[PDB]
Write a protein that binds this ligand. Sequence first.
Ligand code: C8E
Ligand code: CA
Ligand code: CA
Length: 354
Amino acid sequence: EDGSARLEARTVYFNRDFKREEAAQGFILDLRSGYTEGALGFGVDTLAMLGIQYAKAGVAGKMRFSQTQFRYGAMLPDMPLLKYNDGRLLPTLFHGAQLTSEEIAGLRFSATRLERYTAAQDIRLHCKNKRYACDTTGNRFDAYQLDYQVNDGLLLQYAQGGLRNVYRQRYLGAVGKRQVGAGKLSADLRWFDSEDAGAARAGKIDNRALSLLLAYAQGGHTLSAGWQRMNGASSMPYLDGSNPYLANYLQVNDFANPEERSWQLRYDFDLRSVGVPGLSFMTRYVNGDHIRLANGDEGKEWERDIELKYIVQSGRFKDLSLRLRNATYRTDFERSARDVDEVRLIASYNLSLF
Ligand SMILES: CCCCCCCCOCCOCCOCCOCCO
Ligand SMILES: [Ca+2]
Ligand SMILES: [Ca+2]
C-alpha cells in the first residue's frame, strides 16, 4: 500500500444469561506506513491498544521488492489456519514474521512463523470447553499457504502448518461467486486435516473438518445453507485467540466437537432496498448432533443468532456503527454449564487519520 492510519473507538456492552454482564471502552490504533522509495522499500507498522485496564503496543518492520513483502514484529494474522478473533474488546496480538509473494499474478504465496501472542505469552491450543487441555503450549506456530485464483469466479487454496509439539494441520479451500441470473450464487468449500505433532503436548489429536456454505443473493436478500462435519477422535484444533474457519462458526459455539454433524440456515437482509440505507438484518440457525461425548452417549446442541447493524448516514456522528448481536444456545449435555443467552451491543467508530 501507500499507507493507512486508523484510530478506532469501540464501545461494547455484553450480557450473558445462564446474570453476568460487562461494559467496555476500547481504542485501537493501527498505523501502516508507506514504503521508502527505491527498489527495496522500507516502512513501519504499529499497533497500540487501550481498554477498560488493558494497555498494549506493537511495532513491525516491513520490506518490499517487486510483488514480495516481508514483515517482522507485531501482527494480526487473518488466514485459514489462524483467523484472528474480533469478538472481544481489543484483538489478539501475535508476534513473528510474515513473507508474502505474488510475482505471478493470481498466484499468492505466504509464509508465517509466530513465536508469541498477547490476549505477552506463548501460543496456546484453544481449549475453552474441555477435551484439549488448557495451557497447552507450542514453541512457535508455522503456516505456509498457496492461493490460486483460477478465474474471476474461482479461488483455490492450499495451506499447511501447525503449533510445534501440539499439532499439524492441512487445509484445502475453494471459494467463488457466479451470476445466475438476476442474483449472485456463492459456494465456499473448506477442509482441514489435523493430527498431533512432535511431543504431542495435548496429546493425541485426530480430525478431519469439512464445511460447505452455499449462498444465493439477489437485491438485498441472501439465503444461505451450510453443512459441516467432523471426523476422527478429536475436535478440530485451533489457536487460542482465533476462530476456527468453518461455515458453522457462530456467535457462541463452533459445532466442531468430535464427530459432530451440523446444518445451517441463514438469512441476510440489507434494507438499502426498502430505503433505509445503513440498516442490515441477519438471522441464522444451526442444528448439530452426532457428538461423541466422553460419556459414550450422543450429544445434541443448537444455536440461533439474530443481528442488527446500523450505520449512521450523515451528521457529526456519520459512519458510527451500532451493532446488536443475540445468541441463544442449548445442548442436551452439561446443560447448566453451557446453555447461554447472550446479548452484545457494539458501538464502533473508525477515524481515518490520513
Ligand atoms: C423464542 C423466540 C425468540 C425470537 C423469535 C423470533 C422469530 C423470528 O425470527 C427468527 C429467528 O428467531 C428464532 C428464535 O430463536 C429461538 C427459537 O428457535 C427457533 C428456530 O427458528
Ligand atoms: Ca508514509
Ligand atoms: Ca470445540
